[PDB]
């Protein structure tokens, strides 16, 4: 399986409408070698996907969002499910590949009463501690602190890519317009300027928060290359017996 094989089927897998959903397992199957993917816990916390695959003959761990189930929102179960897998992959020198499409965290009363903060911190810490090479691709969405929780550039991430249909923002357009343009009480046009200016990956691109905006069909052809360069990564950290996982 050549490492430069094109995947044109990814050119239109993301619907234009911001309401429809799609299957991330299809993207994972397209990208990996021989379309083989060993999934871990496939029937528990289905809004997140974790598994093992091979890229150019090298074992890699894959974690990603599933927009089909619960819009891809993070909750208590998926946080620990992803966190333990990421920690195990870190412990044995296995690179990580992440696909990000998340609109935030699942709201409710049971989520707060169950302690969603602790498990969100677990996932955040799991990505922050990781010292193996990691590559991240943003397909459609990344909102609020969930964007940071999913291994943004600022958590010592190595390479980040965003598809032309991706978009990064603090919140939704309606919420930002309401919380900013309150006295003006005119959302007829201000929403139009907001969605034509800040509803695109350009604010993140101009500030260097993403390495480059790549065509989907070349996705695989990029990642392999990065995994060739980052194979010799070495970093230094302050000495300690063991850090305090928020369990």
């Amino acid at each position: 399986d050549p490492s430069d094989r094109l995947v044109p089927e990814l050119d239109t897998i993301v619907p234009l409408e911001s309401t429809k959903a799609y299957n991330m397992v299809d993207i994972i199957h397209s990208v990996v070698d021989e379309r083989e993917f060993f999934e871990i816990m496939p029937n528990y916390a289905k809004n997140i996907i974790v598994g093992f695959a091979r890229m150019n003959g090298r074992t890699v761990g894959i974690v990603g969002n599933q927009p089909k189930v619960a819009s891809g929102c993070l909750d208590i179960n998926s946080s620990v499910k992803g966190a333990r897998f990421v920690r195990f992959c870190d412990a044995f020198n296995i690179p990580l590949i992440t696909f990000v499409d998340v609109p935030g965290f699942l709201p409710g009363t049971a989520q707060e009463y169950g302690g969603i903060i602790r498990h969100g911190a677990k996932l955040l810490y799991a990505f922050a501690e990781a010292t193996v090479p990691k590559v991240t691709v943003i397909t459609r969405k990344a909102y609020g602190g969930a964007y940071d929780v999913m291994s943004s550039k600022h958590l010592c991430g190595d390479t980040n890519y965003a598809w032309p249909t991706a978009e990064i923002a603090v919140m939704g357009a309606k919420g930002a317009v309401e919380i900013i343009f309150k006295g003006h009480e005119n959302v007829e046009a201000a929403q139009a300027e907001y969605i034509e200016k800040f509803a695109n990956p350009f604010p993140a691109a101009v500030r260097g928060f993403v390495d480059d905006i790549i065509q989907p069909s070349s996705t695989r052809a990029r990642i392999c290359c990065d995994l060739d360069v980052l194979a010799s990564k070495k970093v230094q950290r302050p000495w300690r017996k063991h850090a305090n996982i928020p369990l």
Binding site: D1, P2, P8, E9, L10, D11, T12, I13, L16, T19, K20, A21, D26, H29, S30, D33, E34, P67, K68, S71, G72, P103
Partner: protein, 673 residues
């Protein structure tokens, strides 16, 4: 291909699919700007990207997108396109569209509205053909009064005559009036059926034709009264009154009959004053007697197969004629240069009523363009979606050769090297048809698919040698995968000791039988013993490519590996058919005898609400047709909306759920069988 001559500089192709792509390609060869129309869904189709401009026309359904008068009118007005080409289907045979286009200033590639109006109804066309001194269908013009009229018609023209209820609407029915008492009782039954169906109670009795062959003649004309007949085509192989395999030169006809049919078609076209490309269809009995049946006033779907054997670009000729130029050829200039066979690859499952519509999104798509003498016409690219609103047709495959046998061999080779992963196609049926003994000999009729498979399509039956080759190939591929699994890199800390196993003893389960296989490897050549028979398998053993070419005892074969599991299950496409096998080691097979079978329970009707929510709009009705896993309804929630399908095939019986209801999880929404 001379571009010096003046031609329209703006053409609008108001169509979709592969015909739009072909027209766009021909116009590009002419150096003419192309403008394409597309619905909201088809915003990323092949044709819309191939063209220069692109104008939307409306929503997904064809009744508001490709059949909308106003949308096309404003598209023409904004674009100011010089000429409009409809292709075939949709609005090709619309007289209203025709004169609406032709009124202001727009030229329309096609026949004039007078010819369409003339050949718009069966009765008027039949009487015009009778006035055109051509061999019409043997019968009488009038109405039946009683059984006396039926028996007098039977005694008038021919003994083998139907009593089928004709005229009215459609004119169909399984009826025979061979004998006098048969004429009487069939007339009674046909009158009863007509009263039940249409109420006409009157018949246009027509003579019976045993196992008829459907031939067709391609005709070309201009505004200067010049008519040409471009050989013939045969479209006998049909199911559901739809052609699947077309064969350009007719093996059943000779020079004299061909010339007679061409002369009759040319005379009919001159009588109607046709000035474009058209087709005249004939039914030929066993006695080599041809009778006229219908005339298509548009470009035929299977026009490339007659284009290959003559080298005449039909779209180019249509454009030149519509410009006003006369034909640049004569009757003697037409030659039958070789042989041609065309097949249609649809997105349907041939194991249910010779094809049922299917949906899905293509994940892998590869054409055998590198094979010799293979032409593919398709409007599909990898990642395309096979929706429900349109025809599920995928592609057209054409093979041209020096004779019939070479063309058939090339067609089989192309079918074996054609990759479609994501949906279900009917390639197995096509390959079985093109290798049947009767089809090879040349004895086919419109009932070929009916009598060859009276029970239905069951697959490609395999002989002893083919079964042995399949088992050897599967065992070799399994052993090759196992061997590749042992190749790691150097560790320098714990050295790897590769095992030195000599023989692999395997149990292979196929259909409902178990065979013992012994496999040995000597580099790139495998020696396989199946039940004593010895075979040699050699290949490059490239496990990443979708297609694998192997050589078993010198015979060259091509296979595909659709599925592979650690449990031993393997799905392999061989000779155009998908076979499921289970390969295990001897020890595993021996130990598996103690594994208890798990009995299933409950009913397959499990569809319910995955989570509580509201239904924005339900679009089902008890008794509605259900496709292969088609989207049955939509339940929306926060942010994203869910669209849950009907994966299990079953006729709708009762829809407990209703639109707008806040049904909880587990509630019975749609009952399916």
């Amino acid at each position: 291909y001379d571009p010096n001559e003046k031609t329209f500089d703006k053409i609008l192709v108001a169509n979709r699919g592969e015909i739009a792509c072909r027209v766009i390609r021909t116009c590009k060869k002419m150096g003419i700007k192309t403008v394409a129309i597309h619905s909201d869904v088809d915003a990323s189709s092949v044709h819309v990207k191939m063209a220069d401009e692109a104008v939307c026309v409306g929503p997904a359904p064809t009744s508001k997108s490709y059949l909308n008068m106003d949308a096309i009118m404003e598209a023409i007005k904004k674009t100011r396109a010089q000429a409009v080409h409809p292709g075939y289907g949709f609005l090709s045979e619309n007289k209203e569209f025709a004169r609406c286009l032709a009124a202001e200033d727009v030229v329309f590639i096609g026949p004039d509205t007078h010819a369409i109006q003339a050949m718009g109804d069966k009765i008027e066309s039949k009487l015009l053909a009778k006035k055109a001194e051509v061999n019409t269908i043997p019968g009488f013009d009038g109405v039946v009064k009683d059984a006396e009229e039926a028996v007098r018609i039977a005694r008038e023209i021919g003994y083998p005559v139907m009593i089928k209820a004709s005229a009215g609407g459609g004119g169909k029915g399984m009826r025979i009036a061979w004998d006098d008492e048969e004429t009487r009782d069939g007339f009674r039954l046909s009158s009863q059926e007509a009263a039940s169906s249409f109420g006409d109670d009157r018949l246009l009795i027509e003579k019976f034709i045993d196992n008829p062959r459907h031939i067709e003649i391609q005709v070309l004309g201009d505004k200067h009264g010049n008519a040409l007949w471009l050989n013939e085509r045969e479209c006998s192989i049909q199911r559901r009154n739809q052609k699947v395999v077309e064969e350009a030169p007719s093996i059943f006809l000779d020079a004299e009959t061909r010339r007679a049919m061409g002369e009759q078609a040319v005379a009919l076209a001159r009588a109607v004053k046709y000035s474009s490309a058209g087709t005249v269809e004939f039914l030929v009995d066993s006695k080599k007697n041809f009778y006229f049946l219908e005339m298509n006033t548009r470009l035929q779907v299977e026009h490339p197969v007659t284009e290959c054997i003559t080298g005449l670009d039909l779209v180019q000729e249509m454009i030149r004629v519509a410009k006003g130029y006369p034909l640049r050829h004569k009757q003697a200039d037409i030659r039958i240069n070789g042989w041609a066979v065309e097949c249609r690859v649809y997105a349907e499952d041939p194991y249910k009523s010779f094809g049922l519509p299917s949906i899905g999104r293509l994940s892998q798509y590869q054409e055998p363009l590198h094979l010799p003498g293979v032409r593919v016409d398709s409007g599909i690219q990898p990642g395309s979606d096979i929706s429900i609103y349109y025809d599920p047709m995928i592609s057209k495959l054409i093979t041209y050769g020096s004779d019939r046998t070479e063309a058939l061999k090339r067609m089989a080779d192309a079918l074996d090297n054609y990759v479609i992963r994501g949906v279900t196609h009917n390639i197995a049926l096509l390959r079985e048809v093109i290798i049947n003994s009767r089809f090879v000999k040349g004895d086919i009729s419109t009932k070929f698919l009916s009598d060859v498979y009276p029970d239905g399509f069951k697959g490609h039956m395999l002989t002893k040698s083919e079964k042995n080759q399949l088992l050897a190939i599967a065992s070799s591929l399994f052993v090759a995968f196992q061997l590749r699994a042992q190749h790691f890199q150097e560790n320098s800390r714990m050295p790897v000791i590769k095992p030195d196993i000599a023989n692999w003893e395997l149990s292979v389960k196929l259909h409902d039988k178990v065979h013992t296989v012994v496999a040995s490897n000597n580099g790139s050549v495998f020696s396989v013993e199946v039940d004593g028979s010895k075979l040699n398998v050699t290949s490059t053993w490239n496990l990443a490519s979708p297609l694998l070419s192997v050589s078993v005892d010198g015979t060259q074969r091509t296979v595909q590996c659709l599925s592979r599991e650690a449990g031993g299950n393997m799905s392999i496409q061989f000779l155009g058919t998908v076979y499921k096998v289970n390969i295990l080691t001897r020890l595993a097979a021996e130990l598996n005898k103690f594994m208890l079978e798990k009995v299933t329970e409950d009913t397959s009707s499990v569809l319910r609400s995955p989570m509580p929510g509201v239904v924005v709009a339900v679009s089902v009705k008890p008794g509605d047709a259900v496709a292969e896993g088609q989207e049955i309804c939509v339940i929306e929630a926060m942010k994203m909306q869910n669209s849950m399908t009907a994966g299990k095939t079953g006729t709708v019986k009762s829809v407990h759920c209703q639109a707008g209801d806040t049904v909880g999880e587990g509630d019975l929404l749609v009952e399916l069988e």
